[PDB]
Protein backbone atom coordinates (compact mmCIF):
# COMPACT_ATOMS: atom_id res chain seq x y z
CA UNK A 1 0.00 0.00 0.00
CA UNK A 2 2.99 2.27 -0.59
CA UNK A 3 1.02 4.14 -3.28
CA UNK A 4 -1.34 5.45 -0.60
CA UNK A 5 1.66 6.37 1.56
CA UNK A 6 3.27 8.43 -1.21
CA UNK A 7 -0.11 9.98 -2.06
CA UNK A 8 -0.50 11.11 1.55
CA UNK A 9 3.11 12.35 1.54
CA UNK A 10 2.40 14.48 -1.54
CA UNK A 11 -0.83 15.76 0.04
CA UNK A 12 0.99 16.73 3.24
CA UNK A 13 3.81 18.42 1.32
CA UNK A 14 1.33 20.43 -0.76
CA UNK A 15 -0.62 21.43 2.36
CA UNK A 16 2.58 22.56 4.10
CA UNK A 17 3.61 24.55 1.02
CA UNK A 18 0.19 26.22 0.89
CA UNK A 19 0.36 27.07 4.60
CA UNK A 20 3.86 28.53 4.19
CA UNK A 21 2.67 30.60 1.22
CA UNK A 22 -0.28 31.79 3.33
CA UNK A 23 1.97 32.76 6.25
CA UNK A 24 1.34 30.24 9.04
CA UNK A 25 4.96 29.85 10.26
CA UNK A 26 5.77 26.45 8.77
CA UNK A 27 9.15 25.13 9.90
CA UNK A 28 11.80 24.14 7.37
CA UNK A 29 11.94 20.64 8.88
CA UNK A 30 8.43 19.91 7.58
CA UNK A 31 9.23 21.50 4.19
CA UNK A 32 12.64 20.01 3.30
CA UNK A 33 11.80 16.53 4.60
CA UNK A 34 12.08 13.56 2.25
CA UNK A 35 9.90 10.51 1.67
CA UNK A 36 12.27 8.25 3.63
CA UNK A 37 12.16 10.61 6.61
CA UNK A 38 8.38 10.93 6.25
CA UNK A 39 7.87 7.16 6.39
CA UNK A 40 10.44 6.70 9.17
CA UNK A 41 8.79 9.33 11.39
CA UNK A 42 5.30 7.96 10.64
CA UNK A 43 5.52 4.36 11.87
CA UNK A 44 3.58 1.29 10.76
CA UNK A 45 0.18 2.81 9.96
CA UNK A 46 -0.98 6.42 10.23
CA UNK A 47 -4.74 5.84 9.71
CA UNK A 48 -5.05 9.48 8.57
CA UNK A 49 -4.76 10.68 12.17
CA UNK A 50 -1.18 11.90 12.70
CA UNK A 51 -1.58 14.55 9.98
CA UNK A 52 -4.12 16.42 12.16
CA UNK A 53 -2.07 19.38 13.43
CA UNK A 54 -2.68 22.97 14.55
CA UNK A 55 -0.91 25.92 12.93
CA UNK A 56 -1.00 29.54 14.10
CA UNK A 57 -0.19 32.78 12.31
CA UNK A 58 3.33 34.20 12.45
CA UNK A 59 2.32 37.77 13.28
CA UNK A 60 -0.56 36.92 15.65
CA UNK A 61 -0.37 33.94 18.01
CA UNK A 62 -4.11 34.07 18.76
CA UNK A 63 -5.23 33.23 15.22
CA UNK A 64 -4.82 29.53 14.45
CA UNK A 65 -6.10 27.06 11.86
CA UNK A 66 -6.40 23.30 12.41
CA UNK A 67 -6.27 20.80 9.55
CA UNK A 68 -8.67 17.89 10.10
CA UNK A 69 -8.39 14.60 8.21
CA UNK A 70 -11.57 12.48 8.27
CA UNK A 71 -11.17 8.87 9.33
CA UNK A 72 -13.29 7.60 6.42
CA UNK A 73 -14.72 8.86 3.14
CA UNK A 74 -18.38 9.69 2.33
CA UNK A 75 -18.61 11.81 5.47
CA UNK A 76 -22.01 12.69 6.88
CA UNK A 77 -23.51 15.09 9.43
CA UNK A 78 -22.22 13.36 12.59
CA UNK A 79 -18.59 14.08 11.69
CA UNK A 80 -19.48 17.69 10.83
CA UNK A 81 -21.21 18.08 14.20
CA UNK A 82 -18.20 16.60 15.99
CA UNK A 83 -15.85 18.95 14.13
CA UNK A 84 -18.01 21.97 14.98
CA UNK A 85 -18.12 20.95 18.64
CA UNK A 86 -14.34 20.48 18.70
CA UNK A 87 -13.80 23.89 17.09
CA UNK A 88 -16.14 25.51 19.62
CA UNK A 89 -14.39 23.81 22.55
CA UNK A 90 -10.85 24.57 21.36
CA UNK A 91 -11.83 28.11 20.24
CA UNK A 92 -10.53 28.01 16.67
CA UNK A 93 -11.99 30.01 13.79
CA UNK A 94 -10.49 28.30 10.72
CA UNK A 95 -10.24 24.66 9.65
CA UNK A 96 -9.27 22.75 6.51
CA UNK A 97 -11.04 19.50 5.61
CA UNK A 98 -9.05 17.27 3.25
CA UNK A 99 -11.78 14.85 2.15
CA UNK A 100 -11.59 11.92 -0.27
CA UNK A 101 -15.04 12.03 -1.92
CA UNK A 102 -17.59 14.77 -2.49
CA UNK A 103 -19.66 16.10 0.40
CA UNK A 104 -23.33 15.33 0.93
CA UNK A 105 -26.01 18.01 0.41
CA UNK A 106 -26.78 17.87 4.13
CA UNK A 107 -23.10 18.49 4.84
CA UNK A 108 -23.22 21.48 2.48
CA UNK A 109 -26.28 22.86 4.28
CA UNK A 110 -24.58 22.36 7.66
CA UNK A 111 -21.37 24.08 6.53
CA UNK A 112 -23.32 26.97 4.96
CA UNK A 113 -25.66 27.52 7.93
CA UNK A 114 -22.76 28.11 10.35
CA UNK A 115 -20.49 29.92 7.89
CA UNK A 116 -21.08 33.23 9.69
CA UNK A 117 -19.68 31.89 12.98
CA UNK A 118 -16.65 30.01 11.61
CA UNK A 119 -15.04 29.67 8.18
CA UNK A 120 -14.29 26.24 6.73
CA UNK A 121 -12.38 25.09 3.65
CA UNK A 122 -12.80 21.79 1.81
CA UNK A 123 -10.08 20.35 -0.45
CA UNK A 124 -10.08 17.12 -2.44
CA UNK A 125 -7.12 14.75 -2.45
CA UNK A 126 -7.02 14.89 -6.26
CA UNK A 127 -6.54 18.68 -6.22
CA UNK A 128 -3.72 18.77 -3.64
CA UNK A 129 -1.36 16.49 -5.59
CA UNK A 130 0.28 19.25 -7.67
CA UNK A 131 1.01 22.71 -6.28
CA UNK A 132 -0.96 25.23 -8.33
CA UNK A 133 1.14 28.22 -7.24
CA UNK A 134 4.37 26.54 -8.44
CA UNK A 135 3.59 26.83 -12.14
CA UNK A 136 4.98 28.84 -15.04
CA UNK A 137 1.55 30.11 -16.15
CA UNK A 138 0.33 31.31 -12.73
CA UNK A 139 1.78 34.79 -12.04
CA UNK A 140 2.63 36.27 -8.66
CA UNK A 141 -0.39 36.93 -6.42
CA UNK A 142 -0.21 39.42 -3.55
CA UNK A 143 -3.15 39.89 -1.18
CA UNK A 144 -3.67 43.52 -0.19
CA UNK A 145 -4.51 44.70 3.32
CA UNK A 146 -7.25 47.12 4.39
CA UNK A 147 -4.98 50.17 4.19
CA UNK A 148 -3.65 49.08 0.79
CA UNK A 149 -7.19 48.50 -0.48
CA UNK A 150 -8.29 51.93 0.75
CA UNK A 151 -5.29 53.62 -0.87
CA UNK A 152 -5.92 51.77 -4.14
CA UNK A 153 -9.58 52.83 -4.16
CA UNK A 154 -8.68 56.44 -3.31
CA UNK A 155 -5.90 56.76 -5.91
CA UNK A 156 -8.06 55.76 -8.88
CA UNK A 157 -11.24 57.16 -7.25
CA UNK A 158 -13.16 54.01 -8.19
CA UNK A 159 -15.66 51.94 -6.21
CA UNK A 160 -14.96 48.34 -5.25
CA UNK A 161 -17.75 47.18 -7.58
CA UNK A 162 -16.08 48.72 -10.66
CA UNK A 163 -13.12 46.34 -10.65
CA UNK A 164 -12.31 43.06 -12.42
CA UNK A 165 -13.88 40.13 -10.60
CA UNK A 166 -12.55 36.73 -9.55
CA UNK A 167 -14.90 34.01 -8.31
CA UNK A 168 -14.41 32.32 -4.95
CA UNK A 169 -14.43 28.88 -6.60
CA UNK A 170 -11.24 29.78 -8.49
CA UNK A 171 -8.26 27.62 -7.42
CA UNK A 172 -6.12 30.64 -6.51
CA UNK A 173 -8.76 32.09 -4.16
CA UNK A 174 -9.08 28.78 -2.31
CA UNK A 175 -5.29 28.39 -2.27
CA UNK A 176 -4.91 31.79 -0.58
CA UNK A 177 -8.11 31.44 1.47
CA UNK A 178 -9.65 34.61 0.05
CA UNK A 179 -13.02 35.80 1.32
CA UNK A 180 -15.53 38.15 -0.29
CA UNK A 181 -14.49 41.80 -0.31
CA UNK A 182 -10.71 41.34 -0.58
CA UNK A 183 -8.64 42.58 -3.52
CA UNK A 184 -5.42 41.03 -4.82
CA UNK A 185 -2.36 42.37 -6.62
CA UNK A 186 -1.20 40.41 -9.68
CA UNK A 187 2.20 41.02 -11.30
CA UNK A 188 2.47 39.86 -14.89
CA UNK A 189 5.88 39.14 -16.52
CA UNK A 190 6.08 45.74 -16.27
CA UNK A 191 2.39 46.28 -15.54
CA UNK A 192 0.19 45.15 -12.65
CA UNK A 193 -3.52 44.44 -12.31
CA UNK A 194 -6.02 44.03 -9.48
CA UNK A 195 -8.88 41.55 -9.09
CA UNK A 196 -11.87 41.85 -6.75
CA UNK A 197 -13.04 38.65 -5.04
CA UNK A 198 -16.83 38.48 -5.37
CA UNK B 1 -52.42 38.04 -72.82
CA UNK B 2 -54.43 34.80 -72.85
CA UNK B 3 -53.67 31.12 -72.33
CA UNK B 4 -52.71 28.86 -75.25
CA UNK B 5 -54.65 25.78 -74.12
CA UNK B 6 -56.76 23.02 -75.66
CA UNK B 7 -60.05 21.64 -74.39
CA UNK B 8 -60.45 18.04 -73.20
CA UNK B 9 -63.57 16.00 -73.97
CA UNK B 10 -64.64 12.55 -72.75
CA UNK B 11 -67.98 10.76 -72.97
CA UNK B 12 -69.71 10.07 -69.64
CA UNK B 13 -72.63 7.63 -69.45
CA UNK B 14 -74.62 7.40 -66.22
CA UNK B 15 -76.51 4.13 -65.69
CA UNK B 16 -79.26 4.02 -63.05
CA UNK B 17 -81.19 0.84 -62.28
CA UNK B 18 -68.67 14.20 -74.40
CA UNK B 19 -68.44 16.94 -71.77
CA UNK B 20 -65.80 19.57 -70.99
CA UNK B 21 -63.53 18.85 -68.01
CA UNK B 22 -60.71 21.36 -68.42
CA UNK B 23 -58.12 22.94 -70.68
CA UNK B 24 -54.48 21.81 -70.53
CA UNK B 25 -51.74 24.27 -71.58
CA UNK B 26 -50.22 23.37 -74.95
CA UNK B 27 -46.49 23.42 -75.62
CA UNK B 28 -45.33 24.99 -78.88
CA UNK B 29 -44.78 22.61 -81.82
CA UNK B 30 -46.42 19.71 -79.98
CA UNK B 31 -48.59 16.95 -81.44
CA UNK B 32 -51.50 19.45 -81.45
CA UNK B 33 -50.14 22.79 -82.67
CA UNK B 34 -50.59 24.84 -85.83
Amino acid sequence: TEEELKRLYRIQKTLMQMLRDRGYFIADSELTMTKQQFIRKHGDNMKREDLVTLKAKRNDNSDQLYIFFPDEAKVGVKTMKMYTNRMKSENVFRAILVVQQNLTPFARTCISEISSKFHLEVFQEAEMLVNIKEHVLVPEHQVLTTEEKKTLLERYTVKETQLPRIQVTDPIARYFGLKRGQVVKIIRPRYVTYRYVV
Amino acid sequence: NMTYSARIKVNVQVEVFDILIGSIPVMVKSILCK
Partner: protein, 366 residues
Protein backbone atom coordinates in the same frame (compact mmCIF):
# COMPACT_ATOMS: atom_id res chain seq x y z
CA UNK C 1 -42.14 -3.47 -48.68
CA UNK C 2 -39.41 -2.70 -46.14
CA UNK C 3 -37.14 -5.18 -44.35
CA UNK C 4 -35.21 -3.61 -41.46
CA UNK C 5 -32.34 -5.07 -39.42
CA UNK C 6 -32.56 -3.64 -35.90
CA UNK C 7 -32.64 -4.76 -32.29
CA UNK C 8 -35.74 -6.43 -30.86
CA UNK C 9 -37.96 -4.28 -28.63
CA UNK C 10 -41.23 -6.27 -28.60
CA UNK C 11 -41.32 -8.95 -25.87
CA UNK C 12 -37.61 -8.45 -25.19
CA UNK C 13 -35.83 -8.70 -21.84
CA UNK C 14 -32.54 -7.18 -20.68
CA UNK C 15 -30.38 -10.16 -21.63
CA UNK C 16 -31.74 -10.71 -25.17
CA UNK C 17 -31.30 -7.44 -27.09
CA UNK C 18 -29.64 -8.01 -30.47
CA UNK C 19 -30.29 -7.19 -34.11
CA UNK C 20 -33.23 -9.04 -35.68
CA UNK C 21 -34.94 -8.95 -39.08
CA UNK C 22 -38.32 -7.20 -39.17
CA UNK C 23 -40.81 -6.67 -42.00
CA UNK C 24 -42.80 -3.44 -42.41
CA UNK C 25 -45.69 -4.50 -44.66
CA UNK C 26 -48.92 -2.46 -44.58
CA UNK C 27 -47.77 -0.95 -41.25
CA UNK C 28 -47.91 -4.29 -39.43
CA UNK C 29 -44.33 -4.86 -38.16
CA UNK C 30 -44.36 -8.65 -38.54
CA UNK C 31 -41.37 -11.01 -38.20
CA UNK C 32 -39.65 -12.18 -41.36
CA UNK C 33 -39.70 -15.93 -40.60
CA UNK C 34 -43.48 -15.92 -40.12
CA UNK C 35 -43.82 -14.32 -43.55
CA UNK C 36 -41.39 -16.89 -44.97
CA UNK C 37 -43.34 -19.85 -43.60
CA UNK C 38 -46.65 -18.24 -44.62
CA UNK C 39 -45.63 -18.15 -48.31
CA UNK C 40 -45.63 -21.89 -48.95
CA UNK C 41 -42.51 -22.76 -46.92
CA UNK C 42 -42.59 -25.55 -44.32
CA UNK C 43 -38.91 -26.15 -43.51
CA UNK C 44 -36.08 -24.13 -41.99
CA UNK C 45 -33.55 -25.80 -44.30
CA UNK C 46 -35.45 -24.61 -47.38
CA UNK C 47 -35.65 -21.08 -45.97
CA UNK C 48 -31.90 -21.07 -45.33
CA UNK C 49 -31.24 -22.41 -48.84
CA UNK C 50 -33.35 -19.60 -50.29
CA UNK C 51 -31.21 -17.02 -48.44
CA UNK C 52 -27.94 -18.15 -50.02
CA UNK C 53 -25.56 -16.02 -47.96
CA UNK C 54 -22.60 -18.20 -49.04
CA UNK C 55 -20.36 -16.66 -46.39
CA UNK C 56 -18.82 -17.37 -43.00
CA UNK C 57 -19.85 -14.79 -40.39
CA UNK C 58 -20.93 -15.09 -36.77
CA UNK C 59 -23.07 -11.94 -36.63
CA UNK C 60 -25.26 -13.03 -39.56
CA UNK C 61 -25.82 -16.47 -38.02
CA UNK C 62 -26.64 -14.89 -34.65
CA UNK C 63 -29.13 -12.53 -36.30
CA UNK C 64 -30.80 -15.41 -38.16
CA UNK C 65 -31.04 -17.48 -34.97
CA UNK C 66 -32.50 -14.48 -33.12
CA UNK C 67 -35.07 -13.97 -35.87
CA UNK C 68 -36.05 -17.65 -35.73
CA UNK C 69 -36.39 -17.51 -31.94
CA UNK C 70 -38.47 -14.31 -32.13
CA UNK C 71 -40.76 -15.91 -34.72
CA UNK C 72 -41.12 -19.01 -32.54
CA UNK C 73 -41.93 -16.98 -29.42
CA UNK C 74 -44.37 -14.65 -31.20
CA UNK C 75 -46.66 -17.42 -32.48
CA UNK C 76 -47.02 -20.92 -31.04
CA UNK C 77 -46.72 -23.84 -33.48
CA UNK C 78 -46.09 -21.44 -36.36
CA UNK C 79 -44.46 -24.17 -38.49
CA UNK C 80 -47.41 -26.60 -38.52
CA UNK C 81 -50.76 -25.55 -39.93
CA UNK C 82 -51.95 -22.15 -41.14
CA UNK C 83 -51.15 -20.30 -37.91
CA UNK C 84 -48.81 -17.89 -39.70
CA UNK C 85 -51.53 -16.86 -42.16
CA UNK C 86 -53.98 -16.23 -39.31
CA UNK C 87 -51.35 -14.22 -37.42
CA UNK C 88 -50.52 -12.04 -40.42
CA UNK C 89 -54.23 -11.54 -41.15
CA UNK C 90 -54.79 -10.44 -37.55
CA UNK C 91 -51.81 -8.08 -37.75
CA UNK C 92 -53.11 -6.54 -40.98
CA UNK C 93 -56.66 -6.19 -39.61
CA UNK C 94 -55.31 -4.44 -36.48
CA UNK C 95 -54.22 -1.34 -38.42
CA UNK C 96 -56.01 2.00 -38.19
CA UNK C 97 -57.30 1.68 -41.79
CA UNK C 98 -57.14 -2.02 -42.68
CA UNK C 99 -57.90 -3.05 -46.27
CA UNK C 100 -61.25 -4.62 -47.08
CA UNK C 101 -59.57 -7.62 -48.72
CA UNK C 102 -58.80 -10.87 -46.90
CA UNK C 103 -55.39 -12.40 -46.18
CA UNK C 104 -55.30 -14.37 -49.44
CA UNK C 105 -56.28 -11.33 -51.53
CA UNK C 106 -53.81 -8.96 -49.85
CA UNK C 107 -50.94 -11.39 -50.57
CA UNK C 108 -51.52 -11.22 -54.35
CA UNK C 109 -52.19 -7.64 -55.50
CA UNK C 110 -50.30 -5.87 -52.67
CA UNK C 111 -47.25 -8.10 -52.03
CA UNK C 112 -45.04 -8.18 -55.15
CA UNK C 113 -47.73 -7.70 -57.84
CA UNK C 114 -45.26 -8.65 -60.59
CA UNK C 115 -44.97 -12.26 -59.38
CA UNK C 116 -48.21 -14.21 -59.77
CA UNK C 117 -47.05 -17.39 -58.03
CA UNK C 118 -47.28 -17.49 -54.23
CA UNK C 119 -43.95 -19.34 -53.95
CA UNK C 120 -41.88 -17.14 -56.28
CA UNK C 121 -42.45 -14.10 -54.05
CA UNK C 122 -40.96 -16.11 -51.18
CA UNK C 123 -37.84 -16.62 -53.30
CA UNK C 124 -37.78 -12.89 -54.08
CA UNK C 125 -38.01 -12.12 -50.36
CA UNK C 126 -35.15 -14.54 -49.72
CA UNK C 127 -33.08 -12.79 -52.39
CA UNK C 128 -33.85 -9.42 -50.78
CA UNK C 129 -32.79 -10.72 -47.36
CA UNK C 130 -29.61 -12.14 -48.91
CA UNK C 131 -28.84 -8.76 -50.49
CA UNK C 132 -29.44 -6.98 -47.17
CA UNK C 133 -27.16 -9.42 -45.33
CA UNK C 134 -24.44 -9.06 -47.98
CA UNK C 135 -24.63 -5.26 -47.72
CA UNK C 136 -24.44 -5.48 -43.92
CA UNK C 137 -21.41 -7.79 -44.10
CA UNK C 138 -19.65 -5.29 -46.39
CA UNK C 139 -19.43 -7.42 -49.54
CA UNK C 140 -21.92 -5.17 -51.37
CA UNK C 141 -21.82 -1.38 -51.62
CA UNK C 142 -24.89 0.67 -50.78
CA UNK C 143 -26.70 2.97 -53.20
CA UNK C 144 -25.82 6.67 -53.29
CA UNK C 145 -27.99 9.64 -54.24
CA UNK C 146 -25.20 11.42 -56.14
CA UNK C 147 -24.92 8.86 -58.96
CA UNK C 148 -27.23 9.07 -61.97
CA UNK C 149 -27.48 5.26 -62.08
CA UNK C 150 -30.00 5.44 -59.22
CA UNK C 151 -31.72 8.66 -60.37
CA UNK C 152 -34.49 9.27 -62.92
CA UNK C 153 -35.79 12.54 -64.35
CA UNK C 154 -39.33 13.54 -65.34
CA UNK C 155 -39.99 16.52 -67.62
CA UNK C 156 -43.68 16.46 -68.57
CA UNK C 157 -44.99 12.87 -68.65
CA UNK C 158 -44.99 12.60 -64.85
CA UNK C 159 -44.47 16.18 -63.62
CA UNK C 160 -47.87 17.38 -64.87
CA UNK C 161 -49.41 13.92 -64.45
CA UNK C 162 -49.71 14.16 -60.66
CA UNK C 163 -51.16 17.67 -60.90
CA UNK C 164 -53.75 16.42 -63.39
CA UNK C 165 -54.55 13.46 -61.12
CA UNK C 166 -55.01 15.57 -57.98
CA UNK C 167 -57.12 18.14 -59.85
CA UNK C 168 -59.28 15.32 -61.25
CA UNK C 169 -59.64 13.83 -57.76
CA UNK C 170 -60.72 17.19 -56.34
CA UNK C 171 -63.20 17.65 -59.19
CA UNK C 172 -64.60 14.15 -58.60
CA UNK C 173 -64.98 14.83 -54.87
CA UNK C 174 -66.79 18.11 -55.57
CA UNK C 175 -69.02 16.42 -58.14
CA UNK C 176 -69.99 13.56 -55.82
CA UNK C 177 -70.64 15.99 -52.95
CA UNK C 178 -72.89 18.05 -55.22
CA UNK C 179 -74.68 14.90 -56.40
CA UNK C 180 -75.26 13.75 -52.82
CA UNK C 181 -76.59 17.20 -51.94
CA UNK C 182 -78.79 17.36 -55.06
CA UNK C 183 -80.08 13.81 -55.61
CA UNK C 184 -81.76 13.57 -52.20
CA UNK C 185 -84.78 15.84 -51.77
CA UNK C 186 -80.36 16.26 -64.16
CA UNK C 187 -77.86 16.18 -67.03
CA UNK C 188 -74.26 15.15 -66.40
CA UNK C 189 -73.03 18.44 -67.89
CA UNK C 190 -73.80 20.33 -64.66
CA UNK C 191 -72.41 17.99 -61.99
CA UNK C 192 -68.84 17.93 -63.34
CA UNK C 193 -67.00 21.21 -62.77
CA UNK C 194 -65.15 22.42 -65.87
CA UNK C 195 -63.23 25.34 -64.30
CA UNK C 196 -61.54 23.86 -61.20
CA UNK C 197 -58.83 22.02 -63.15
CA UNK C 198 -58.16 24.99 -65.45
CA UNK C 199 -57.88 27.38 -62.50
CA UNK C 200 -55.59 24.97 -60.65
CA UNK C 201 -53.31 24.59 -63.66
CA UNK C 202 -53.22 28.36 -64.16
CA UNK C 203 -52.35 28.91 -60.50
CA UNK C 204 -49.64 26.24 -60.64
CA UNK C 205 -48.09 27.78 -63.75
CA UNK C 206 -48.30 31.34 -62.40
CA UNK C 207 -47.23 30.96 -58.77
CA UNK C 208 -44.73 28.22 -59.64
CA UNK C 209 -45.79 25.92 -56.79
CA UNK C 210 -45.95 22.26 -57.80
CA UNK C 211 -47.30 19.20 -56.02
CA UNK C 212 -44.80 17.24 -53.95
CA UNK C 213 -44.21 13.65 -55.15
CA UNK C 214 -44.53 12.22 -51.62
CA UNK C 215 -46.57 14.86 -49.75
CA UNK C 216 -50.00 16.33 -50.45
CA UNK C 217 -49.15 19.67 -48.82
CA UNK C 218 -45.86 21.62 -48.80
CA UNK C 219 -45.73 22.56 -52.48
CA UNK C 220 -42.20 22.85 -53.85
CA UNK C 221 -40.96 25.87 -55.79
CA UNK C 222 -38.45 26.32 -58.59
CA UNK C 223 -40.14 23.75 -60.83
CA UNK C 224 -41.42 26.19 -63.49
CA UNK C 225 -39.27 29.19 -64.44
CA UNK C 226 -39.25 31.94 -67.07
CA UNK C 227 -37.27 32.37 -70.29
CA UNK C 228 -34.75 34.98 -71.40
CA UNK C 229 -34.75 36.90 -74.67
CA UNK C 230 -31.37 38.65 -74.37
CA UNK C 231 -29.83 36.10 -76.77
CA UNK C 232 -30.89 32.71 -78.19
CA UNK C 233 -28.10 31.01 -76.21
CA UNK C 234 -29.86 31.89 -72.95
CA UNK C 235 -33.17 30.39 -74.07
CA UNK C 236 -31.31 27.35 -75.43
CA UNK C 237 -29.57 26.69 -72.11
CA UNK C 238 -32.72 27.43 -70.08
CA UNK C 239 -34.65 24.70 -71.91
CA UNK C 240 -31.90 22.15 -71.08
CA UNK C 241 -31.47 22.01 -67.30
CA UNK C 242 -31.81 19.49 -64.47
CA UNK C 243 -32.80 20.43 -60.92
CA UNK C 244 -31.97 18.46 -57.76
CA UNK C 245 -34.43 19.07 -54.92
CA UNK C 246 -32.41 19.33 -51.69
CA UNK C 247 -33.86 20.56 -48.40
CA UNK C 248 -31.99 23.61 -47.05
CA UNK C 249 -29.88 24.33 -50.13
CA UNK C 250 -27.57 26.26 -47.81
CA UNK C 251 -25.90 22.96 -46.83
CA UNK C 252 -25.96 20.85 -49.99
CA UNK C 253 -23.49 18.24 -48.73
CA UNK C 254 -22.18 15.68 -51.22
CA UNK C 255 -24.51 16.49 -54.14
CA UNK C 256 -22.51 19.56 -55.20
CA UNK C 257 -19.38 18.06 -56.77
CA UNK C 258 -19.21 16.34 -60.17
CA UNK C 259 -19.64 12.56 -60.17
CA UNK C 260 -18.04 10.01 -62.54
CA UNK C 261 -21.58 9.08 -63.61
CA UNK C 262 -21.83 12.56 -65.19
CA UNK C 263 -19.67 11.39 -68.12
CA UNK C 264 -21.43 12.34 -71.35
CA UNK C 265 -24.80 13.05 -69.69
CA UNK C 266 -24.56 16.42 -67.90
CA UNK C 267 -21.91 19.13 -68.02
CA UNK C 268 -19.44 18.76 -65.14
CA UNK C 269 -17.66 22.03 -66.02
CA UNK C 270 -20.55 24.55 -66.11
CA UNK C 271 -22.57 24.98 -62.92
CA UNK C 272 -24.42 28.06 -61.61
CA UNK C 273 -22.15 29.77 -59.10
CA UNK C 274 -24.02 30.66 -55.92
CA UNK C 275 -26.36 29.00 -53.44
CA UNK C 276 -27.65 26.46 -56.01
CA UNK C 277 -24.17 25.39 -57.16
CA UNK C 278 -24.21 21.73 -58.18
CA UNK C 279 -28.00 21.46 -57.85
CA UNK C 280 -28.64 22.79 -61.38
CA UNK C 281 -26.84 20.78 -64.06
CA UNK C 282 -26.81 21.60 -67.77
CA UNK C 283 -27.29 18.65 -70.11
CA UNK C 284 -24.65 17.74 -72.68
CA UNK C 285 -25.03 18.13 -76.44
CA UNK C 286 -25.36 14.36 -76.96
CA UNK C 287 -28.02 14.02 -74.26
CA UNK C 288 -31.23 12.04 -74.73
CA UNK C 289 -33.99 11.07 -72.29
CA UNK C 290 -35.51 7.61 -72.62
CA UNK C 291 -39.29 7.28 -72.83
CA UNK C 292 -41.61 4.46 -71.83
CA UNK C 293 -41.56 1.48 -74.18
CA UNK C 294 -44.88 0.31 -75.61
CA UNK C 295 -43.91 -3.21 -76.72
CA UNK C 296 -43.35 -6.13 -74.36
CA UNK C 297 -39.89 -7.73 -74.32
CA UNK C 298 -40.82 -10.86 -72.34
CA UNK C 299 -41.45 -12.97 -75.45
CA UNK C 300 -38.29 -11.68 -77.13
CA UNK C 301 -36.22 -12.44 -74.02
CA UNK C 302 -37.67 -15.95 -73.79
CA UNK C 303 -36.91 -16.47 -77.49
CA UNK C 304 -33.20 -15.79 -76.91
CA UNK C 305 -32.90 -18.78 -74.57
CA UNK C 306 -33.96 -17.49 -71.16
CA UNK C 307 -35.79 -20.07 -69.05
CA UNK C 308 -38.65 -19.37 -66.67
CA UNK C 309 -38.13 -19.08 -62.93
CA UNK C 310 -38.70 -22.26 -60.94
CA UNK C 311 -42.07 -22.35 -59.19
CA UNK C 312 -41.00 -24.89 -56.55
CA UNK C 313 -38.94 -23.57 -53.64
CA UNK C 314 -37.23 -26.93 -53.04
CA UNK C 315 -35.14 -26.81 -56.23
CA UNK C 316 -32.12 -24.50 -55.83
CA UNK C 317 -30.00 -22.79 -58.48
CA UNK C 318 -26.52 -24.14 -59.27
CA UNK C 319 -24.93 -21.50 -61.51
CA UNK C 320 -27.95 -19.87 -63.14
CA UNK C 321 -27.83 -16.08 -62.93
CA UNK C 322 -30.83 -13.88 -62.20
CA UNK C 323 -32.61 -11.82 -64.87
CA UNK C 324 -34.24 -8.62 -63.62
CA UNK C 325 -36.59 -6.56 -65.81
CA UNK C 326 -37.44 -3.17 -64.26
CA UNK C 327 -36.67 -4.63 -60.85
CA UNK C 328 -38.87 -7.70 -61.46
CA UNK C 329 -37.53 -11.26 -61.48
CA UNK C 330 -38.61 -12.76 -64.81
CA UNK C 331 -36.36 -15.79 -65.32
CA UNK C 332 -32.93 -17.39 -65.14
CA UNK C 333 -30.02 -17.70 -67.56
CA UNK C 334 -27.29 -20.34 -67.67
CA UNK C 335 -24.45 -18.27 -69.18
CA UNK C 336 -24.71 -14.50 -68.87
CA UNK C 337 -22.04 -13.57 -71.43
CA UNK C 338 -23.60 -15.29 -74.44
CA UNK C 339 -27.10 -14.21 -73.39
CA UNK C 340 -26.05 -10.55 -73.18
CA UNK C 341 -24.16 -10.80 -76.48
CA UNK C 342 -27.20 -12.28 -78.24
CA UNK C 343 -29.50 -9.67 -76.70
CA UNK C 344 -27.21 -6.86 -77.88
CA UNK C 345 -27.02 -8.42 -81.35
CA UNK C 346 -30.82 -8.57 -81.51
CA UNK C 347 -31.06 -4.95 -80.34
CA UNK C 348 -28.58 -3.77 -82.99
CA UNK C 349 -30.66 -5.48 -85.71
CA UNK C 350 -33.76 -3.36 -84.95
CA UNK C 351 -35.42 -6.32 -83.21
CA UNK C 352 -35.45 -4.79 -79.71
CA UNK C 353 -36.21 -1.30 -78.39
CA UNK C 354 -33.28 1.06 -78.82
CA UNK C 355 -33.85 2.71 -75.41
CA UNK C 356 -32.91 -0.39 -73.43
CA UNK C 357 -30.02 -0.97 -71.02
CA UNK C 358 -28.40 -4.39 -70.58
CA UNK C 359 -26.24 -4.68 -67.46
CA UNK C 360 -24.12 -7.75 -66.63
CA UNK C 361 -22.11 -7.71 -63.39
CA UNK C 362 -20.00 -10.63 -62.14
CA UNK C 363 -20.25 -9.52 -58.49
CA UNK C 364 -23.98 -9.99 -57.87
CA UNK C 365 -24.21 -12.78 -60.50
CA UNK C 366 -27.29 -11.33 -62.18
Amino acid sequence: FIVRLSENEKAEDYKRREKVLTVYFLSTEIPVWLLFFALGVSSDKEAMDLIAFDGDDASITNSLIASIHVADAVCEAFRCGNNALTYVEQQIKSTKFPPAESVDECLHLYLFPGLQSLKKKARFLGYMVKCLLNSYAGKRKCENRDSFRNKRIELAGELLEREIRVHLAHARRKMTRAMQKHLSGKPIEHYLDASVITNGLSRAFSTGAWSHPFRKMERVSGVVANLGRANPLQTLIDLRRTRQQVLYTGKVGDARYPHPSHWGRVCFLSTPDGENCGLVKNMSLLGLVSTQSLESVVEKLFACGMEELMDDTCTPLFGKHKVLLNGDWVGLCADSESFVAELKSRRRQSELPREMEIKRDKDDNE
